[PDB]
Design a protein around this ligand. Structure first.
Ligand code: HEM
Length: 149
C-alpha cells in the first residue's frame, strides 16, 4: 500500500537490505545507479525516500529478473484524469508470458508517477512491447530499467 524508492550505489543500498531483513526490499541494478523498492503498509526505512501510494497492483514483488519504470510527470490538475484512466486499463499486461508484477504509483514527493513492471527476463518485456496489447504532462516521460543483482 505504500512503496518507497531510493537510489544510490549498490554497495550503499545493500547495507539497508541487510539492516532490515524482515522487510521486503528489492534491490536492482541500473545504468546510473542501483534502486531499492520497498512495498509496505508501514513506515519507510530509507533516509529521504521517494514515497508513493499504490493505486493499482497485480502480482508479488519477489525476485524478478528485470524491472521497468515508466516515469510520467503529471500536472496537479491532470492527476484526477490520469488516475481515472487506470480503471479503464486493458488489463492485458498481467497476462503476458514472463510477467511478474505491476504497481501504478501515485507520487507524494514529486509530480512523477511511476508505472512499475517486473518481469522474469528482459525478453519477456520486449515481447510485450512488441505485442498488440502495448496537456496533462509537466515535462517529457522517460523510462528507466534495472536488472537483478
Ligand atoms: C514508454 C513507457 C511506458 C510503459 C512501459 C507503460 C506501461 C503501461 C502499462 C503496463 C499499462 C497497463 C496496460 C494494461 O492494463 O494491459 C499502461 C497503461 C497506461 N499508460 Fe502506459 N506505459 C508507458 C508510457 C506511457 C506514457 C508516456 C503515458 C502518458 C500518458 C502513459 C499512459 C498510460 C495510461 C493513461 C494507461 C491506462 C490504460 C490506458 O488508458 O491505456 N503510458 N502503460
Amino acid at each position: 500500500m505504500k512503496v518507497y524508492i531510493t537510489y544510490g550505489t549498490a554497495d550503499f543500498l545493500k547495507t539497508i537490505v541487510k539492516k532490515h531483513p524482515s522487510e521486503n526490499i528489492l534491490l536492482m541494478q541500473g545504468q546510473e545507479n542501483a534502486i531499492l523498492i520497498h512495498e509496505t503498509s508501514g513506515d519507510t526505512v530509507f533516509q529521504a525516500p521517494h514515497a508513493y501510494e499504490v493505486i493499482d497492483q497485480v502480482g508479488e514483488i519477489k525476485h524478478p529478473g528485470f524491472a521497468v519504470l515508466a516515469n510520467i510527470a503529471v500536472t496537479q490538475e491532470g492527476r484526477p484524469l490520469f488516475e481515472n484512466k487506470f480503471k479503464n486499463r486493458a488489463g492485458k499486461v498481467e497476462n503476458e508470458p514472463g510477467f511478474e508484477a505491476i504497481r501504478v504509483l501515485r507520487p507524494l514527493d514529486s509530480d512523477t508517477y511511476v508505472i512499475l513492471t517486473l518481469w522474469e527476463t528482459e525478453r519477456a518485456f520486449q515481447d510485450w512491447q512488441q505485442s498488440d496489447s502495448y496537456s496533462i504532462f509537466s515535462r517529457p516521460s522517460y523510462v528507466t530499467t534495472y536488472f537483478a543483482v
